[PDB]
Amino acid sequence: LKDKILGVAKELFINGYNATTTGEIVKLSESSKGNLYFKTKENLFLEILNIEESKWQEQWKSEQIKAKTNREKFYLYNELSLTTEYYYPLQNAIIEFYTEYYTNSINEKMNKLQNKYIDAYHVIFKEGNLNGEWSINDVNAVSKIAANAVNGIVTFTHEQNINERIKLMNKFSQIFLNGLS
Amino acid sequence: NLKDKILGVAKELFIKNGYNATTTGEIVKLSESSKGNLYYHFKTKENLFLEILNIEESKWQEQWKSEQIKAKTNREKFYLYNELSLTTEYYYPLQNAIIEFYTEYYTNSINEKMNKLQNKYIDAYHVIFKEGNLNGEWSINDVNAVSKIAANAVNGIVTFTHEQNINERIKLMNKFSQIFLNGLS
Ligand SMILES: CCNc1cc2oc3c/c(=[NH+]/CC)c(C)cc-3c(-c3ccccc3C(=O)OCC)c2cc1C
């Protein structure tokens, strides 16, 4: 029954973490105070990141076959990253959470959510070493970089023409990938 | 000095209490000023904050100009700048008040000046890349884009890697600086 609440949450969060609150989440939704018990707010929010992280991650599975090689897949995952409505449009809300509501158990809990977000790149780079497109020496490192680099392009340019955004991402994808060969 | 005092008191107020918490009345009283003189200079708390952010911006470029003497070549400069940016986040106090503000207003009016404010930060790369071209450290026939990219690539690495110990994160950032810079030839 209580799956309805998440829609108002995902919606509201993408106003921010601070601005949205347990009151708004219930009253603007119609559900008892107790019924919402994921116990804490940071347990609710952290749950939403997974449903959106998964949604994106299965959209990428459904769209990546168009990329024939791994080199194309890298370009594409980064392009698609800009256009998706999953995960990446919450990233602002995380930055607040990252640097405010962080209990020590929450840190370790959502580190698994981090490792999920790199595995897109981990698979790609490993497969490149396999399919013979390049030779990475420390992949899990190079993935952490490519990912966070990319997240940077996506998040910190949410205020200009979308055709341009894609061009800058493409250029990055090209530079980065070339730095490995 | 009543303008500068307000900015100065506002800053330390924001640092201690955060954007949303700090009130105009507090700023007014503690700087021994008046709501009028505040409205005259700044109009809104929204704007006052931007002026602080611009003062700090200039302190940064001032700081950089001094620190970059340490790095001889433009290759070295690029490495060092990206490091400095990474180390910063750990102890910059306005950090938290900036995240509040940034998310509370990104209004096409307020967002206008926030963009103009990042262009000064991008101009740092723009120089490094430009000057590297002239000494022949690389060939970039498109210095403005690659500047935009580098800026946001670094900022992404700084901001979205708040789990590891500082040793590891400097190791990553330099590995990025290595890969990126390498793939320009
Ligand atoms: C020892 C002095 N250390 C400094 C450290 C700083 O760290 C910053 C970290 C950040 N971390 C991510 C949230 C963001 C956004 C801005 C920062 C600024 C900053 C603030 C206002 C305007 C521009 C900048 C800025 O960095 O750009 C200047 C060109 C900043 C400024 C100074 C002086």
Curated annotation (Swiss-Prot), chain B:
Functional description taken from the UniProt entry: Transcriptional repressor of qacA. Binds to IR1, an unusually long 28 bp operator, which is located downstream from the qacA promoter and overlaps its transcription start site. QacR is induced from its IR1 site by binding to one of many structurally dissimilar cationic lipophilic compounds, which are also substrates of QacA.
Record keywords: DNA-binding, Plasmid, Repressor, Transcription, Transcription regulation
Oligomeric and partner information: Homodimer. Binds cooperatively to DNA as a pair of dimers.
PROSITE patterns: HTH_TETR_1 (PS01081), HTH_TETR_2 (PS50977)
Protein name: HTH-type transcriptional regulator QacR
DNA-binding residues: 23-42
Source superkingdom: Bacteria
The HTH tetR-type domain, residue ranges: 1-60
UniProt-listed GO biological process terms: negative regulation of DNA-templated transcription
Molecular function, one GO term: DNA-binding transcription factor activity
